[PDB]
Amino acid sequence: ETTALVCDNGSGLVKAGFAGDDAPRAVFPSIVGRPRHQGVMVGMGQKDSYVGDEAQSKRGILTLKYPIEHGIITNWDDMEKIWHHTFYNELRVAPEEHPTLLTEAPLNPKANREKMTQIMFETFNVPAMYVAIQAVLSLYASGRTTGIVLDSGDGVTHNVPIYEGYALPHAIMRLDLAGRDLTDYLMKILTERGYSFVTTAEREIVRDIKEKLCYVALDFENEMATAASSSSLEKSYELPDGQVITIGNERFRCPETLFQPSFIGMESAGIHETTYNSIMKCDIDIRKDLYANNVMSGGTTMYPGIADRMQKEITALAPSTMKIKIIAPPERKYSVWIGGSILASLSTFQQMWITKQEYDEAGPSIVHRKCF
Amino acid sequence: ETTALVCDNGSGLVKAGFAGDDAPRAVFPSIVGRPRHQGVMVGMGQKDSYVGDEAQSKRGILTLKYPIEHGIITNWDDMEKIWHHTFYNELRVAPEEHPTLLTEAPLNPKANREKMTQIMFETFNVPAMYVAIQAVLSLYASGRTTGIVLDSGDGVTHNVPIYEGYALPHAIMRLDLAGRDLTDYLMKILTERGYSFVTTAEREIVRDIKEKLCYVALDFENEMATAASSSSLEKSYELPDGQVITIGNERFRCPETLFQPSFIGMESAGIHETTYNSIMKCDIDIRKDLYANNVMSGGTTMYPGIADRMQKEITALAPSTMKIKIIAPPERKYSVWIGGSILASLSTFQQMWITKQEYDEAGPSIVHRKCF
Amino acid sequence: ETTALVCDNGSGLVKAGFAGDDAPRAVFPSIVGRPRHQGVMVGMGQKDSYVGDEAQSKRGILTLKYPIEHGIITNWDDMEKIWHHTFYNELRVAPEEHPTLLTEAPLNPKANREKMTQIMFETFNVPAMYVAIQAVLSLYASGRTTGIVLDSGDGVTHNVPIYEGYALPHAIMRLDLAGRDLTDYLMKILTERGYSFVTTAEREIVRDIKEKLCYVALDFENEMATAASSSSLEKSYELPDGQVITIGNERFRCPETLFQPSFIGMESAGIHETTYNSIMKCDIDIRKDLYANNVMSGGTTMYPGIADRMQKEITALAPSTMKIKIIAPPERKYSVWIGGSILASLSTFQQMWITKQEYDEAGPSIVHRKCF
Amino acid sequence: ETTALVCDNGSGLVKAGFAGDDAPRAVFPSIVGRPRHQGVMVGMGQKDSYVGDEAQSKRGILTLKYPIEHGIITNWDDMEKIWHHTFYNELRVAPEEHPTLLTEAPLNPKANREKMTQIMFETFNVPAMYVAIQAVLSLYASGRTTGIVLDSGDGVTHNVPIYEGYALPHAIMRLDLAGRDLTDYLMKILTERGYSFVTTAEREIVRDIKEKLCYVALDFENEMATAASSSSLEKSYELPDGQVITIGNERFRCPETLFQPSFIGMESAGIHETTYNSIMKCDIDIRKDLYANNVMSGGTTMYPGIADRMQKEITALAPSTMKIKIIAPPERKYSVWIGGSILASLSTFQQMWITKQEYDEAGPSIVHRKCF
């Protein structure tokens, strides 16, 4: 025990590394896949469940299912499997090798974090462990102490404002529109072209289309009228079976959902009015220093041209005299793990762990009160 | 010990300097601010209480509270904090570097001054110290020996008459209507426009509006009828979050309170009948030399057009044959500290100090009888 | 014209009746709902906006929005719609059938009342009309002339002291914490159990949970420790889709906000220190007769066990020698309309109306000065 | 032009009639058959392609092929042939005799509907035409305005929820398991008895077996164990060549696919979890009124004992306190045409047509936006 594990259990992509490094060493999708055909060969009981990286290569014969959705762990036997695969088969370190720094989204059920802690203590027997907040670590990665964080991951999208050290918990805005909800919308708007992706394996193909051809239109209606000259926008993607598909205005109608949540039948406001409505609930004096630091995090905020549309639509709401400046790091996809590597390597933090003794003698309610 | 400290502990703005200078070197608001949110960053026990100048810049996340109100020190742990911040972090001189000349309003409780003295002796260990009267120092600054002093500060407003050297203590008129009481009235008459300032941070924004847009109408009803042509008076102020507000006849209804104390539900007379009623209690011969010298002091008497309204409404009461002349220096805001720099640099005064020895051997009742 | 209309436009629930009756005849929630889906049937332009009672039954496909919030009318086209629905479709009387007695909260913008009057005169053409004060009518319903009124409605909560006939306007304490602000807090503390109500329709379900399962703990910390024996308190509510939910210590953490306004991130004092601080600003002699009559009004003051907690926490502040007695009528929910039925049926009042002639020839500024 | 044509182009059975009638007049299978032998007689070029009813009687020497599959028109020269056979040889009315009301399944490619419209305008020259939705017409036939529609036809099976007028498009669940997919499964499970139907003509014999001997077992495993007493279930069908066959537990293993889509190697859920999962995506308030109206449509939902199994397996999922009631009309096979005869005879609809002028001057994109 000299270094510590930093294991960000994303909603769709598990990242894990060592406290002190500059980038995680174990980045693999958080899937659990079961085989659904008979298996006539002699490999009958041969790996009745694949996890992570293999469950993506052999995904032709597998029903893939995520153990996490919308930040809430819904399948505990698959999450123990994914963890046990991270510690042993990917990081190749014992659990009691180091303390652990897990991460979870804000405003989650009180039972999810307690069950995380119980598993990590009574099944892997970690010496110590601490559960950070995905939106406070995203500032550490940027070396700031003030700003509003839009940490739109893959299962959840949340705004968290933080003045110079002090978080304002009464203004945290959560919203359950994220990357998976855009993949499922791209699966639907693609039928109108003729392509029908239905299975759970085809889902991981539309995810790949989304990550490669989809951009966010700076203005929606102008680009939608530009798609009438139906050649200056269409791109072609090559499926795994050699077939080709051509998507046109589906390139910006998939990520426009984040600004038009009524597309997928949600009565909520875009990520430009859950950031502005969150700044208009902070006290009037810190309102000027939050406009100038909208740090962005999470994978889904990697769409080409999302920082500019945010910066253009917030400035259309905020008073016209002061500065809007979206701070989009180039590595923001890992911006939550990087922060976790920083906070776990600070000397000021080497106290806040929750050790096995302190857990057993204080009950499972000890893990909530460590800073909210 | 060659120079002496002159530390005027105002009711809302602490001023402090060196005996002999021409203007104080340490002018900072007398606030103590506590943080009220959690503070998720590693700065947990990072400055659990801000004082003075910082507690004004970071006032977004702070509950600000004044340790003094109406001249009476109501929170002794905050006043020691503000003093200790004046001596060390602002003047950068040791306490036992010099004697001190404190100041306090007339007719205060007998315990307030005694506790001031006890703190200064047993906690900062000043060599000597003396407590002047805010209304006798305001004449020194003007180089006079006769006149009536209307020292309307921020916590209290008091008239004190003084003939050629001899104060008349039986005519000192105190009144608890001051700058804070006008700020709280501007916070109320502003709702009727729609703007709602409720917090303790917004209080320091309505104070800023008051100090910039508020004037005193020479005649009230005429100006109130002029505000019917609802363009020739309205001004626009820009809040810290870029929003703008437009105040009209609220510009002269906030400081009219001093002449109409029934606005804030007080049964007392304006500052034009607590000066006149104080001259009509002085003996009939000195009554002519007090009309001609109404020196004015204190911050709140900086409203544009207050000297003229005083000079116009007293002359409507006093007998019609003799002169009314309001003497309003251009620097009267510091007129109490300037005087304190004079009286502490006189050779005739270098005796009246109360030294540590003279204090211990005479008890805490030695500090009242040094000239009232 | 023999009887008169009494139409209390609450902040969340419109009540309307006839002057002289014993209880209002038209009590319906003040909502305006728009449809948000396409509407494929032949009912295309079929009721493009529902109001009041229908907009509550069909609230599955509707975005519901209140035209009033915090007593200030923010959407004038919806308020005309709700009025026009009260007069014609609910009371079934013409507007010029009778004069009207509207009601509004104290310390509102000067434009809200003027626009109310302009609408009622130039769009419904009422013969006469008068705007009372929600806290002076709540005494008429009780047959008193002395007492302090805590009229905590659904948009605003205000204390108003009244000695024998004479109101003390310099002590009226307003506070913007009310029923809607508690519903939005119950929407937040319920996520920690797992239930996520996000829409505007689910808001009217958490309102129903609040009105049925929420009580006010006589002592907070004792009950919060009693909720550790996590069976003796939990209740079960059945949602409209047959699902069941179980709320435990959320039953008294929702209405505790009124005594702990820092829960929802407000820097103000509970309704036990905005009543006490309002009595300590009335003159020392009437201070004894206001302690003995804390009449309570408004809907939100119907929580089981709120009168006892008020009576127990004020008595912990007021001097220990005299009587505290909270007067909580059993019908206080309508206590403001009942009073309006009394004052509009008095012979002494049949003068104070503002008739169309008196309005046009005196301008829209005639409606403020009728008793404040 | 006084009446209008209502031509439901099913996926396997074309129905066509007149707007206003009570039942279609032209119900014929939508097949196109080519001869595949030489034809030695003098009838060389004698009807080189048979359509509809003849292509079923002479199906011994014909290769039969459907021009539609899974709702998508895949062979446009055969679909023009089938239409031209409906208008002229079966209805015996000119195309420009009346406007037309076509029908198509939800979530189809955007090109299929546009090509339908282009053909009907530029090749038959209909005066007007409109394309309804197979699941909104199935309610008109029942005289409802609220309910969920399970319109399992012959090429596609889709659930569509509709509250009182307003469809919820974000919850429409499509699934490509239908009657043809059950015929092809009965062609496979029949080999295990010895009977081998391979041709395209034998397909229309296994379809006939399916329509006559197949029922849906109320409970699967119990009936499958009852088929061990291998006499109480077996039925005997007589092929067209006098041979007889005896099918036993193949009677309920063919339609069980709709509840066990993994039989034909599909990773999807039965029609009891694409209805329940569609109600659990509608808003929580309309969830109670959709449980009580599961109107059923389409041919394949005519299996003896399917309404009871649906009503028994949904009630095992939905909360146990409220009502499940499958509304299965006795004529539901035509329930989509009946509705089309109603909507085309309403006065409220006589506007929504798309006339030739309105088409040419607005382009082929005018036909999508007429209500989705």
Ligand SMILES: Nc1ncnc2c1ncn2[C@@H]1O[C@H](COP(=O)(O)OP(=O)(O)O)[C@@H](O)[C@H]1O
């Ligand atoms: N380059 C990209 N462009 C657009 N979307 C992306 C890109 N990379 C990842 N995504 C989306 O973001 C998700 C990954 O986000 P991530 O931050 O890993 O989520 P989590 O917070 O669960 O870790 C993926 O599911 C994918 O849908």
Ligand SMILES: Nc1ncnc2c1ncn2[C@@H]1O[C@H](COP(=O)(O)OP(=O)(O)O)[C@@H](O)[C@H]1O
């Ligand atoms: N230029 C100005 N115009 C109007 N009011 C002012 C102005 N400057 C200060 N004030 C008011 O006067 C107060 C400062 O008065 P000051 O003399 O410092 O009080 P003290 O006697 O406590 O030192 C401030 O609180 C402010 O409300």
Ligand SMILES: Nc1ncnc2c1ncn2[C@@H]1O[C@H](COP(=O)(O)OP(=O)(O)O)[C@@H](O)[C@H]1O
């Ligand atoms: N029995 C009850 N228990 C608790 N809260 C209630 C109860 N009845 C109503 N409320 C709350 O009070 C509000 C109604 O108060 P009301 O006096 O009608 O407001 P207004 O002053 O706008 O008329 C509702 O919004 C509801 O939240």
Ligand SMILES: Nc1ncnc2c1ncn2[C@@H]1O[C@H](COP(=O)(O)OP(=O)(O)O)[C@@H](O)[C@H]1O
């Ligand atoms: N009585 C029946 N029992 C079982 N299946 C039937 C019955 N009648 C028809 N079918 C099946 O339903 C199909 C006809 O359904 P239909 O509603 O005509 O489809 P479409 O939606 O294309 O019109 C046929 O292909 C047949 O397989």
Ligand SMILES: [Mg+2]
């Ligand atoms: Mg993340």
Ligand SMILES: [Mg+2]
């Ligand atoms: Mg002063």
Ligand SMILES: [Mg+2]
């Ligand atoms: Mg009310």
Ligand SMILES: [Mg+2]
């Ligand atoms: Mg059909």
